[PDB]
Amino acid sequence: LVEKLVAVDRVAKVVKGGRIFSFTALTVVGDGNGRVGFGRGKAREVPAAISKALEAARRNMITVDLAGTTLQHPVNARHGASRVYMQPASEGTGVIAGGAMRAVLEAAGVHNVLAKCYGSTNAANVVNATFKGLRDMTSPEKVAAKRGKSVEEIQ
Amino acid sequence: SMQDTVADMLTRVRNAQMAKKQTVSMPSSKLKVAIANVLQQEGYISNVEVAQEETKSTLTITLKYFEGKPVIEMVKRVSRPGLRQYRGKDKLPSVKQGLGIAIVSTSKGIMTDRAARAAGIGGEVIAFVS
Amino acid sequence: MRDLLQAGAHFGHQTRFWNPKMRQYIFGARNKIHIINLEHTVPALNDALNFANQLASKKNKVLFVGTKRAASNIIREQAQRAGQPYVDHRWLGGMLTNWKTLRQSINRLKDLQTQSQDGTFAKLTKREALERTREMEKLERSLGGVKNMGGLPDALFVIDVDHEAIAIKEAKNLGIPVIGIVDTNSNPDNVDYVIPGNDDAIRAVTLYASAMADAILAG
RNA sequence: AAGCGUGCGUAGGCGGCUUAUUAAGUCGGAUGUGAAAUCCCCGAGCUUAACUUGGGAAUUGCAUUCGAUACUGGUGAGCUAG
RNA sequence: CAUCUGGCCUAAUACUGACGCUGAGGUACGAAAGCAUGGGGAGCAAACAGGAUUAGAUACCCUGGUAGUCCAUGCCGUAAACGAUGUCUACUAGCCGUUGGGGCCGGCUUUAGUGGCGCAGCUAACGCGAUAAGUAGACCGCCUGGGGAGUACGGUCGCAAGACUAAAACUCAAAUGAAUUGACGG
Ligand SMILES: [Mg+2]
Ligand SMILES: [Mg+2]
Ligand SMILES: [Mg+2]
Ligand SMILES: [Mg+2]
Ligand SMILES: [Mg+2]
Ligand SMILES: [Mg+2]
Ligand SMILES: [Mg+2]
Ligand SMILES: [Mg+2]
Ligand SMILES: [Mg+2]
Ligand SMILES: [Mg+2]
Ligand SMILES: [Mg+2]
Ligand SMILES: [Mg+2]
Ligand SMILES: [Mg+2]
Ligand SMILES: [Mg+2]
Ligand SMILES: [Mg+2]
Ligand SMILES: [Mg+2]
Ligand SMILES: [Mg+2]
Ligand SMILES: [Mg+2]
Ligand SMILES: [Mg+2]
Ligand SMILES: [Mg+2]
Ligand SMILES: [Mg+2]
DSSP states (O other): OEEEEEEEEEEEEEOSSSEEEEEEEEEEEEOSSSEEEEEEEEESSHHHHHHHHHHHHSSSOEEOOOBTTBOSSOEEEEETTEEEEEEEOOBTBOEEOOTHHHHHHHTTTOOSEEEEEEEOOOHHHHHHHHHHHHHTOOOHHHHHHHTTOOTTTOO | OOOOSHHHHHHHHHHHHHHTOSEEEEEOOHHHHHHHHHHHHTTSSSEEEEEESSSOEEEEEEOOEETTEESOOOEEEOSBTTBOOOOOSSOOOOGGGGTSEEEEEETTEEEEHHHHHHHTOOOEEEEEEO | OTTTTTTTTTEEEETTSOOGGGOTTEEEETTSEEEEOHHHHHHHHHHHHHHHHHHHTTOOOOEEEOOSSSSHHHHHHHHHTTTOOOBOSOOOSSTTTSHHHHHHHHHHHHHHHHSSSSSOOOSSOHHHHHHHHHHHHHHHHTTGGGSTTOSOOSOEEESOTTTTHHHHHHHHHHTOOEEEEEOTTSOOSSOSEEEEOOTTOHHHHHHHHHHHHHHHHOO
8 A cells, every 4th residue: 555645734823922833744545456545634743744644544545447557438527626637548658647646546556647637736626636536437347237238238 | 488409308307317306207309209219229218208198299208227326427418509510420429438328310310429430420419428 | 014003103293394305205294294104114124123133143233322312211221131232311422433532431431330339449538439429420321331342333223313413424434334213304314224113202112122122132 | 807777679690399392501422633842651772860762641621423311401381388 | 636558467268370589789768966948945955154172173073054955848878777696498305484366175285476494516615505606508798917097099979077989108926705713993
């Protein structure tokens, strides 16, 4: 279960005599075969917040059916003001994607994909959108299952 | 006034599927019935029944669910009265790489995109269903 | 199916507070009162009540939730008359989710209820002894029927889908199974073995509880 | 940042249902055309490479002609949910 | 209160047979203030005058007070003219009020309005939620960082006050929305 720390920010809160500082971290975990999850942590120091985030990320994991090591079809997804588009590529390309997206793609076992973010590039909302896009992508088996056909009769 | 009557059928169906209705009933016409039969063959709905009253006919579709989700996930009008589509034969659109159908009107009737690439034709693109 | 129509489960609530999502199991409104469907109650109560024995066979216990003040004094009895856990004072937010939190309270309570009546706690003041007694008694108020658990349950059995939401939500969070007597004024939303019935009556609640304890008795 | 203060209306755009016909949009085939160079692909000369060069592919545009009629348009005949 | 007059709702029965929707230009109407001619003028009251308060007080407060507010006949064409939400059509859980009708046995149901809650969905959030900001279709209007500037010049309109149409050089790296934790409030 390989772990990928995506973002680490320092946030402040006003009190009567000055500022109280703290840290948030956003991390991704996955194995490399179709299971990935993401989480967030908060703490007064950076390693403590990272630990908290990783523990919150080891739940909220999902499973995703994928054609070899690329997507089954093109995916549109969004969370809040962030939009992500993903396309299956053919072997020999890498993950052509930017930052927050890769960690969700690389940690689930995707090796060839064309990906592009529109809208806001907030890392947390981008990771949320990509997660939602992989969670609701379907394979050629569930489609024929729910339609009363076989995998051959459809394509 | 209502001016697209096929988009109205697709909207009635889309709304019923997310209100979890069992059947949906609309006014009927030859093109609506043809499209619903293409939906039935592909396995997206269960049953299609038309019934005439004295002069006007009403059409009743019976929907499908699976794992507590509706079977029609996406249904989209493509060629509206404000912009008609008319693809050729190399340019027929493939919906979700082939895990969905595209309803096409050609001079041999209404069919799906994969069924018209075989015949070597293709006219107006009615809708995408995935 | 006649004992179903016998205990008082015929009537539901009044025809203004009905969660609209429970109409597939509604019959009519007599004197402005909706009635459950016995065909949908007695033929589903048994489909749910098979699972209690089919689980106790492997011997994994099930928690029992009732606190609505009209079925707490029946849940006190009919739940420890079958050798299982119980909770009948309040849902005590975050027990099935922060179990590692309430565990220390349960340990301190077992130590204060095990070393105060069998360990000869002497050489102390009477006022302090009475204070510690009242403290462990209030600690037993909402932890006593769930003392010898040490593990997370395998399924819950509720008496009001409405009044026990902090429990059903926690169950769905932790992925456990849940069975409840959802009435007409209650949403059948996430209780996974749903049984209709008049949750507000002493008789119907007690008859369902007796059937549950008997189902778990064939162990 | 962005619904005219509100109507009514001209050009325009878009328009219910059934049927017969037409074949303009739409779709298919065939024929002529789309200079060479350039871009791309095999491979040949330069010691290699730039570079030069053989053959292809492409130039999916245009026009002419023969067909197909589901949809949109035209024409005739019907209907009553607007 | 009389006279003249427009629309809406509601029930049957009959009739016509797509006669429709939207609309660039164009026209009609359009609060208050203001203008023109002729009247009227109780109360109120821009301007103005005096009395206070004040460091000062061209203000707030007090005593007065003319335009104006009213009528007749015309002009102006603008407002936070706001639901800050174009018009038209269809569809999608429920519960509680209220106005005008129809039906039925105080209550039920239906139809056109007008309010409060609220599932799904939607939204940056706040919120909206059959009177949508949900799901869709038809046509129109408008937006493209802040200032300069809704201004200059040219034109049209107006008695004028002005309205409408509508830039640029130059300058800056922000300006803005919604929510959060403090602090502060005559
Ligand atoms: Mg604004
Ligand atoms: Mg308006
Ligand atoms: Mg016209
Ligand atoms: Mg026309
Ligand atoms: Mg032709
Ligand atoms: Mg050439
Ligand atoms: Mg006609
Ligand atoms: Mg009248
Ligand atoms: Mg006639
Ligand atoms: Mg109009
Ligand atoms: Mg205009
Ligand atoms: Mg005065
Ligand atoms: Mg204005
Ligand atoms: Mg405005
Ligand atoms: Mg009402
Ligand atoms: Mg009424
Ligand atoms: Mg509300
Ligand atoms: Mg809307
Ligand atoms: Mg909005
Ligand atoms: Mg001006
Ligand atoms: Mg504040």
